[PDB]
């Protein structure tokens, strides 16, 4: 039996789908795992790892992050509020990266993906840090289709958490670039009702959300710094079997609460 798992199973049954959770206490090595190795659509959440890959490239291409990109109107797609606002100005690669992370800007994500050689390029970066699960296959907006059983544009809660740790706390990025990634995550604007809602207000959080919407499909991943303790890294993903099934932020927050509670 798995008593630790029963509250999660209860939660996803009330929800009407599947919830996937993985949390790592980087001090103790303790973990909390629920459907941790099943695939879930990435939706917008891929944009965190996208920003990381751009940061890694900027270590080896001098002035890359400072480079202005003067994109045209044909680079724009729905829900690109920052990219639209800066259309007549242009944006640096840094600014695009922060827009992708902190506002989930779609156009900014597509412009950066192009710089890396498209979804296959981001996938190759993820492989280079030892992540064999992550895959990005399509661009915005098609990557959000979230069709049950389609492996395209998916990862697992465990692989996400493991890769997040490597990039934010490990050595996969050089220190200045690691700190930039952490700062982008900390300044995220879209995650207030997800993992941030599960966390004491005095603990620092950096996160990135995803919301495909269809098939009850949404997610959040985070690094959490509890006051006086090593950081906790975690990922919460949801999906559901019917196209009209509605995602729930509350369910992502409740799952996060159970992970933090289950840790030692
Ligand atoms: C990503 O899943 N999305 C981008 C945008 N904001 O969502 S997020 O903050 O939950 O990441 C709208 C939904 C979506 C998309 N359809 O591109």
Numbering used by the authors: 26 to 289
List passages from the publication reporting this PDB structure.
Bacterial β-lactamase enzymes are a major contributor to antibiotic resistance by hydrolyzing β-lactam antibiotics. We found avibactam covalently bonded to S70 in the active site of KPC-2 and SHV-1.
KPC-2 hydrolyzes clavulanic acid, is phenotypically resistant to inhibitors and bacteria expressing this class A β-lactamase represent a major global health threat. When bound to KPC-2, avibactam makes hydrogen bonds via its carbonyl oxygen in the oxyanion hole (comprised of backbone nitrogen atoms of S70 and T237), via the amide moiety with N132, and via its sulfate moiety with residues S130, T237, T235, and the main chain oxygen of T235. Residue W105, located 4.4 Å away is providing modest van der Waals interactions with the C4 atom of avibactam. In addition, K234 is potentially making a long range hydrogen bond electrostatic interaction with the sulfate moiety of avibactam with a distance of slightly greater than 3.3Å (not shown in Fig 4 due to cut-off 3.2Å distance used). The observed presence of the covalent bond involving S70 as well as the hydrogen bonding network between S130 and K73, and K234 and S70 are all conserved in CTX-M-15, SHV-1, and KPC-2 although the distance between S130 and K73 is somewhat larger in KPC-2 (3.35 Å) compared to the 2.8 Å and 3.1 Å distances observed in CTX-M-15 and SHV-1, respectively. The KPC-2:avibactam structure aids in explaining the structural basis of engineered substitutions that were shown to lead to resistance to this inhibitor against KPC-2. The second residue that impacts avibactam inhibition in KPC-2 is K234R. This change (K →R) has an intermediate effect on ampicillin/avibactam resistance; this side chain is hydrogen bonding to S130 in the KPC-2:avibactam structure. This is anticipated since this residue is not within hydrogen bonding distance of avibactam in the acyl complex structure, it is positioned more than 4 Å from the sulfate moiety, but could still have a significant electrostatic interaction with the negatively charged avibactam group. The chirality of N1 of avibactam is likely S in KPC-2 although the 1.8Å resolution of this structure is not sufficient to assign this chirality with 100% confidence; in the other β-lactamases, it is either R or planar.
